[PDB]
Amino acid sequence: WRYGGDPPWPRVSPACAGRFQSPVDIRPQLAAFSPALRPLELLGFQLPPLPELRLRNNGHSVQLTLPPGLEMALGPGREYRALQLHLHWGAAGRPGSEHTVEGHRFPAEIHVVHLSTAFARVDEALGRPGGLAVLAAFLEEGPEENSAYEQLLSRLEEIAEEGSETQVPGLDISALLPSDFSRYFQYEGSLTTPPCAQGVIWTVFQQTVMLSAKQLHTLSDTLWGPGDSRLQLNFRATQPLNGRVIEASFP
């Protein structure tokens, strides 16, 4: 499987043709306000410079491996530990976010992938409701160089070859996320690549994060994927809700 044409994803993974896939188009007016949704809790995300973290070009994204002890709660007793994060992005002059808002695709999107602490292993959790939870944020263009993102973007040139990897200093993972942890959309969907396993709780922050134009260009223009090809437009098309109501934590 690659982005941009065959093999068709259901022929790779029949799961990719399930009823409750991700990503989706968020339409705020149809989202259901649910006051039960409490502010996200993220502890342990402020990493010291040592030890160092693996940053890998895997041909589908750039992926940072997170150490044990990043703990996240979606609600009382509903806790998670962070595994990895990675980006989705477009190309020169084209947005590449996975989720969209009223049809708007954003320049890029960050995913932070967590495992329910009720499961010892990711593979127990795949397919199980709530087993995995992803935190997603939109990346937009802004006037300033983002210092937290720059720690990653300034290392992309060292892993430009598909399958290559570097070690980065520890950073504040929470500094990559939006201001307000109380404002988000939530629904249940899937991995957005094969194996397209369902039961994934998606939390999309209402607020975006801002990168410079140079920074965004760096993200789309630096990396090389499968073939002799450019790692770009690494996003799945939005998928039908098929009866799912997207919930929101704010009126």
Added chain:
Amino acid sequence: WRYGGDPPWPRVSPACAGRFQSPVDIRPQLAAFSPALRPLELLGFQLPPLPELRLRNNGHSVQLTLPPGLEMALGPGREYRALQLHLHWGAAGRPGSEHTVEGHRFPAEIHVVHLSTAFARVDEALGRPGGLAVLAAFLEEGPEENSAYEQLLSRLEEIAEEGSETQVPGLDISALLPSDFSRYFQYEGSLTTPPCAQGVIWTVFQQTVMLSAKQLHTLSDTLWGPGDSRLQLNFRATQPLNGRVIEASFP
């Protein structure tokens, strides 16, 4: 373990000392309206007379083992299958529901216990988020005789001994529940007996079921529990929410 005596329940199952137990006191005023909560759907609940079901006095309740093919959806993609139902009751002039509403305990309560389709068996589901789901309804004294309930209650004399069981004709299991599947409370909780595992989605109907006074008397006055004593007041003490919000499917 018994209702009232030894051993203490945390000695049996550590999980019985979790923060997020059931049952709870439903305060409808503090409940969060959640328009995402749609009407529950049941498939396969209208059973024919054969094959027969096992109904058992297990010393703590009367439990009807349910057959395969009883499917229940909490919403799009939240699919379950019924395992069993059982009842909780009081005594003469003493109410015996497990849940209470604004402190009010009802004469009795029915539980339909279900397993998430993501799990092959209960011990995999225990402690996992959304692994089990209980539909719960209160039974109240009413003027007419409930004929759905008469089917089961007329067979109780046969299982008066603790640990005894009988076979009973299949019936419309859905007729044991309220007719309104759209007005309900929902919260995350625990099993109300050891192992008291959390991760359980409780759905408590707003509409009640009506039994006659004879019926309620049959229920509470027929069966015998451990030792020389009657099986009565077979309900756990209300448990503090500990910061959980109960959702309501209605404003």
